[PDB]
Design a protein around this ligand. Structure first.
Ligand SMILES: Nc1ccc(NC(=O)OCCCCO)cc1
Ligand SMILES: Nc1ccc(NC(=O)OCCCCO)cc1
Ligand SMILES: Nc1ccc(NC(=O)OCCCCO)cc1
Lengths: 440, 437
């Protein structure tokens, strides 16, 4: 294959003097202008101001200043605010809305020295497992331009898979981080709910950012980059992982869901991952009396999701959800969260697919209820695949999406590693150890 | 009296056994709670058996930061086998089957729970009185109220019954009782400590906007340790070594309420003593949010949260979409405080405008009044001093400052930025040192 520097390797090269911040920034610009043609992932570009910031980083390096991401070029999802840059969420009506202040996540990454070259592609309203909008066009999977690289962080995942930038950052309310990392075969971490501030992830022309279920998290090509970006961006420093190796680790292996289906190639890939951990001293269960009702989980999650996305509004003549019923729904969520608390008293991590299949062909139908999917040559519902993603989003747990391999058509298959709440560093560390075990 | 850490060190050092320390606290309660009526739920039989179990762990060389330390907790927290009523008669015989999260954490650190402390009905008053247990009287003056919601907790601390407590706070429930009784109480950062087990009786409804739980003690060191034990994730420790260079915003006025003379000069005395220790003090700032708009937005959200979104028949309830917009108003107010704490390390202000008032019979706050320097001031408007930390989510420390003309304690409120709960404790400890020249 062809390789690039990771985020940490880039900072190491700049700090060591083998290259400068302006050289790494110019190399990233050239990679974008050379590879983004048939991919169309970096849809907002800030190259002139980025060269100035890289020159400012070289001036800091010269003054013996060292920061974890000093001079490291990166992009961020288009929904995040960067002062002077547009934030449209794909809407043609908000194409010329220019942010006047940097988002919290951008401010934290900048304070650590990161240089932002631009922003990556998204679907309209962030409501799709593709990345296509009338402002910028469509993002194509780098492994197969006929397939979707989407999930709403797809521009971000495509840029990482194409080697344009070593680090990115997305949001996730229905798989928006795990799914693009899965389709494009990169690393994505859905973080614990309320662990990272959503400030600056505003809907265009408002200051409305906070929303239940939704989180933001880092996306990269190595797990160590995820751990660094998480420490830079989290509200407070989260507990570091003490998991030294895989022996004794307790795994719950799920290759089936009561409300959706999975590829036989995906099922075997997840089984191959758990088997590599048994060979490293881990214990793997395939069922537990403490697994919450996943069927009831996705139903409660779906109805809370639709309420949050509609902001409590109902169609014409339809009666809306009352505020009292909303408080009861949040109680239903906390009840499910406690159910996962009992489960994680018996297990350290859940291994399961990110989605039932790999990247699907480009769709022009916005309505998910008017789509379908091809699984092992059979047709299946499209929206039903949300069940694979519901557990971490509804329960609030962190969930890692790490590369496993590829199916028969060369489309990447990823693993979903769900750990208990606030154990985001465990998920990263487990993913790091799983990759090494697969190397053996 | 021995504090929480001192009690753990004394038991570990052979000054007493966990059972002896348990018996000694039971004696202090039965000797002092007569005119106080603070520890209203008692679990002495199981506490002694838990104390004997702690002694076996001590002899087994196990060491935990609160091993064998006897304490109580606010009655609204669930303890397995004890009632949780929130002062309601209907819920007097609601027995919890499992410990609350805070109780479970404190027990895992070795704490021994003797019982629970008194509360008002529904945790909805600045007094502690209910038909199930009676009234709690301020240990400094039996005719004055002991504090609100967490009143039995603060009374037990001021009377030397137990060294550590824990309460909740949605409208000053931790700061006000600590103020009325002259003890330490920490209103923590919102969502920093799990409310699990602080359920409404016979439900699993504990989560609620604005409301937080926090420790209550007699020393700031006990607050920090109790915070580290109970927080969801360990919070950043404080790097503040002294008061030199600290940026303090001194507030003694509010556009919608008022504080009496002794309170105003007590807050200024704390500010001036930090100024003598190297801190810089300001009395105004352009980055100070509109406190009039804040207390209006806060009390609107407070009533909606307490009403669970219900409105009486005839009235139309707040729609869910309007509730979402209200939460955007709070987040907008939180960013406004973010910019304020870029210029200041802490706000110094009263906990309440006056000291502990006489026991009031009137349940309607609108029919109550307060004696402020002989004048008559509206009762409910005093929520203003409480609204900033609750609506903005910041941590707020309530620490002893002194007393007024009648010997009633006056406390200082120390507000720091969100997730700097240890900074608030640390600053409060340095203030206490500065006031002992
Ligand atoms: N029902 C449904 C809605 C949206 C998505 N897109 C997604 O993956 O998350 C979007 C992240 C938005 C953060 O506010 C998928 C399914
Ligand atoms: N994260 C998020 C996603 C979609 C919406 N939906 C919407 O259109 O509300 C815009 C706010 C209008 C305030 O007047 C809101 C937030
Ligand atoms: N309007 C108003 C309501 C309640 C209080 N009592 C208080 O201080 O907090 C109570 C803690 C409840 C935790 O759920 C004061 C004023």
């Amino acid at each position: 294959a062809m390789s690039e520097l990771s985020a940490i390797e880039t900072a190491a090269a700049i700090a060591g003097g083998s290259m400068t911040a302006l050289e790494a920034c110019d190399a990233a610009i050239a990679r974008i202008e050379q590879r983004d043609g048939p991919i169309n992932a970096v849809v907002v570009r800030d190259f002139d101001r980025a060269r100035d910031a890289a020159k400012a980083a070289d001036a800091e390096i010269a003054a013996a200043v060292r920061k974890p991401l000093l001079g490291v070029p990166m992009t961020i999802k288009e929904s995040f605010d960067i002062a002077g840059l547009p934030t449209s969420w794909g809407f043609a009506e908000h194409a010329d809305h220019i942010a006047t202040a940097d988002s919290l996540v951008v401010s934290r990454l900048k304070a650590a020295g990161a240089v932002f070259l631009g922003k990556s592609n998204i679907p309209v309203g962030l409501a799709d497992w593709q990345s296509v909008n009338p402002n910028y066009g469509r993002t194509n999977n780098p492994h197969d331009h006929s397939r979707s690289a989407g999930g709403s962080s797809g521009g971000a995942a495509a840029a990482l898979a194409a080697g344009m930038v070593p680090l990115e950052y997305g949001s996730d309310i229905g798989g928006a981080i795990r799914v693009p990392a899965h389709f494009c075969g990169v690393w994505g971490l859905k973080t614990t709910f309320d662990a990272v501030s959503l400030e600056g992830h505003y809907f265009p022309r408002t200051d409305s950012a906070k929303a239940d279920l939704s989180v933001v998290g880092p996306m990269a090509r190595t797990p160590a980059d995820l751990a660094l970006a998480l420490d830079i961006t989290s509200k407070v420093p989260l507990p570091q992982s003490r998991i030294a190796n895989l022996s004794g680790l307790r795994i719950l292996l799920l290759t089936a869901h009561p409300e959706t289906v999975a590829d036989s190639a995906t099922i075997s890939a997840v089984e191959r991952a758990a088997a590599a951990c048994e060979a490293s001293g881990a214990t793997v269960a395939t069922s537990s009396p403490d697994l919450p009702d996943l069927s009831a989980l996705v139903a409660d999650y779906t109805r809370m999701l639709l309420v949050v996305l509609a902001r409590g509004l109902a169609p014409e003549g339809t009666e809306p959800v009352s505020l009292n019923a909303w408080y009861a729904m949040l109680d239903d969520q906390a009840r499910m969260m406690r159910a996962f608390d009992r489960l994680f008293e018996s297990f350290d991590a859940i291994f399961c697919p990110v989605l039932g299949t790999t990247a699907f062909a480009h769709s022009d139908e916005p309505d998910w209820a008017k789509r379908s999917l091809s699984i092992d040559g059979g047709i299946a519902p499209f929206a039903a695949q949300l069940g694979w993603i519901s557990m971490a989003t509804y329960g609030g747990m962190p969930a890692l999406s790490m590369p496993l391999g590829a199916d028969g058509n060369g489309l990447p298959i990823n693993l979903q590693i769900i750990t208990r709440n606030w154990s985001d560093h465990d998920a990263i560390r487990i993913g790091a150890l799983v990759a090494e075990a697969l190397d053996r």
